[PDB]
Amino acid sequence: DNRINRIVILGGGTAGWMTASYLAKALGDTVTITLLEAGVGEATVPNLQRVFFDFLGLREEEWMPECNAAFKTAVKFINWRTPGPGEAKARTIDGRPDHFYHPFGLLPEHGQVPLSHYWAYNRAAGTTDEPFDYACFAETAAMDAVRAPKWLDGRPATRYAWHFDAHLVAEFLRRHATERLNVEHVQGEMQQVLRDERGFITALRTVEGRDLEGDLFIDCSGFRGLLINKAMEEPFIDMNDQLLCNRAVATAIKHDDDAHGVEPYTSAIAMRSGWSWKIPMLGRFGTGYVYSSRFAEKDEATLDFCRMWGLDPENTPLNQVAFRVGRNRRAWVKNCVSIGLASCFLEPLESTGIYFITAAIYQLTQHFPDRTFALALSDAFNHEIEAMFDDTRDFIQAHFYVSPRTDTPFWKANKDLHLPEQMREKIAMYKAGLPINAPVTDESTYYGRFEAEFRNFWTNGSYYCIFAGLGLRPDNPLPMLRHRPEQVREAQALFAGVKDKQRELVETLPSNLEFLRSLHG
Numbered sequence: 001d002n003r004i005n006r007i008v009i010l011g012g013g014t015a016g017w018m019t020a021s022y023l024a025k026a027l028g029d030t031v032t033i034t035l036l037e038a039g040v041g042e043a044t045v046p047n048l049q050r051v052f053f054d055f056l057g058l059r060e061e062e063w064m065p066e067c068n069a070a071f072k073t074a075v076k077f078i079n080w081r082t083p084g085p086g087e088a089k090a091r092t093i094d095g096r097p098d099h100f101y102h103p104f105g106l107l108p109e110h111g112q113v114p115l116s117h118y119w120a121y122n123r124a125a126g127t128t129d130e131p132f133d134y135a136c137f138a139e140t141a142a143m144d145a146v147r148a149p150k151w152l153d154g155r156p157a158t159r160y161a162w163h164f165d166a167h168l169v170a171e172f173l174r175r176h177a178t179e180r181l182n183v184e185h186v187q188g189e190m191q192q193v194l195r196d197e198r199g200f201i202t203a204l205r206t207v208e209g210r211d212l213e214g215d216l217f218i219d220c221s222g223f224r225g226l227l228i229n230k231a232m233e234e235p236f237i238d239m240n241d242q243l244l245c246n247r248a249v250a251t252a253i254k255h256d257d258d259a260h261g262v263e264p265y266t267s268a269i270a271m272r273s274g275w276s277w278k279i280p281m282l283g284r285f286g287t288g289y290v291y292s293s294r295f296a297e298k299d300e301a302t303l304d305f306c307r308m309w310g311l312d313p314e315n316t317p318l319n320q321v322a323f324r325v326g327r328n329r330r331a332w333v334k335n336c337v338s339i340g341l342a343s344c345f346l347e348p349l350e351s352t353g354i355y356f357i358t359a360a361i362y363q364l365t366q367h368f369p370d371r372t373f374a375l376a377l378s379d380a381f382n383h384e385i386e387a388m389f390d391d392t393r394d395f396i397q398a399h400f401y402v403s404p405r406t407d408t409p410f411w412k413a414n415k416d417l418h419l420p421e422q423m424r425e426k427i428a429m430y431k432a433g434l435p436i437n438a439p440v441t442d443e444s445t446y447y448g449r450f451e452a453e454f455r456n457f458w459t460n461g462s463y464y465c466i467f468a469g470l471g472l473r474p475d476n477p478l479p480m481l482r483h484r485p486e487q488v489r490e491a492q493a494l495f496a497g498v499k500d501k502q503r504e505l506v507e508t509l510p511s512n513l514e515f516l517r518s519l520h521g
């Protein structure tokens with residue numbers, strides 16, 4: 001009667017085929033879906049399996065071997081506290097290497113107080129100088145030991161996500177969507193966008209003559225935004241005043257994994273005018289220098305990038321990419337919904353690209369319209385997308401704002417940018433000893449249901465991982481702890497349990513290389 005009958009997806013990369021697969025599984029044979037289609041590594045977050053691949057019925061043992069996928073236990077931040085050149089290895093500060101981890105999972109609590117706050121109490125008490133991540137996360141020792149996140153037979157050990165080749169994932173999903181979910185793939189470019197009297201898109205015209213008619217249209221055309229920006233004329237909110245990076249130079253490097261294994265984490269390596277990612281996979285790693293054009297020249301960044309990896313810049317294939325940092329004013333206008341780069345983009349500092357797509361796809365089915373296109377459905381969708389993006393945007397900027405580096409104009413200028421009021425409050429709260437967005441559920445519920453994580457994506461553990469990782473600690477511990485000395489004494493058993501877990505994980509887990517060879521061999 002009024003149900004959507006036909007959906008047309010413009011764009012055939014990761015965003016397009018994730019959208020085509022998920023909507024085709026959700027809607028079944030009730031909707032015709034057609035996609036019009038005209039690697040330096042990518043990292044993800046743990047919810048990708050339960051929200052996406054589990055929805056499609058795809059076990060990790062099936063889709064991982066077909067995309068050269070590898071495991072991610074954390075993001076490791078390197079040289080964000082010490083001045084110097086852009087180098088792959090961590091510098092030394094206070095006898096330790098200048099690195100810290102941002103693992104997944106939720107911190108345990110004693111007395112409804114996160115473990116981070118007991119670590120901060122012991123740092124203030126002067127009885128320990130251990131870093132926050134090594135005291136509260138057992139995953140830190142495993143990643144140093146380059147362990148897999150699971151035993152070879154599948155026994156679980158630590159919360160993990162995935163590194164993979166985005167092109168191979170897109171091809172896997174295309175072969176899934178077309179062979180199993182009746183999604184129709186159409187080659188060729190888009191000649192014109194047909195609109196009716198109200199401005200709603202009515203069909204996409206190919207260069208051959210074919211109208212791809214539909215009731216709902218999904219813009220997955222990447223930075224080009226052929227539908228949402230060009231056709232629908234929705235303006236883009238440039239946010240590069242707040243996040244200065246807007247360029248990247250990237251490549252693939254073959255890696256002899258038998259020398260030092262395969263790191264089960266994404267690296268984020270501080271540079272003179274930005275930061276470099278390192279995304280390890282079996283036999284090779286993807287890497288890219290993200291920098292600000294306003295502080296480094298193209299050739300400068302290119303040479304800095306090659307110098308860090310010992311690459312010959314004259315005989316090295318390089319991707320030179322310019323970024324659009326920000327989001328559309330509205331992600332969904334009339335019957336056009338933008339997903340992926342067509343909607344918004346942030347530098348991949350905390351690996352939120354696939355998550356932004358997965359979240360936009362989930363929220364789309366939660367607000368799925370009919371041909372009436374009730375304004376409340378797209379308004380509520382746009383608010384969820386807008387709040388999801390701005391929250392992560394402010395979180396990423398705090399990595400630069402809180403870093404103590406002032407040695408280059410770039411690092412120093414980040415301290416001169418306007419700090420958003422809500423992040424100002426979070427830093428003031430953290431300094432007063434308060435938790436920031438402490439988790440209200442256990443880890444099973446958090447990762448079990450997507451709406452629980454969505455409403456609290458960056459928890460207290462994450463703000464402590466970044467703030468304490470960058471050397472910022474509370475002015476004083478949580479004041480109530482000075483009234484609960486028995487809690488402090490009891491909570492120390494939690495630190496001894498982490499040390500117990502660190503010993504057994506290093507001593508019994510297989511290497512990350514061993515698991516990848518079992519999975520891909």
Ligand SMILES: N[C@@H](Cc1c[nH]c2ccccc12)C(=O)O
Binds near residue numbers: 074102105
């Ligand atoms: N909601 C995410 C938050 C998170 C923790 N550590 C991270 C590292 C990278 C990116 C996101 C995260 C999760 O717990 O899974």
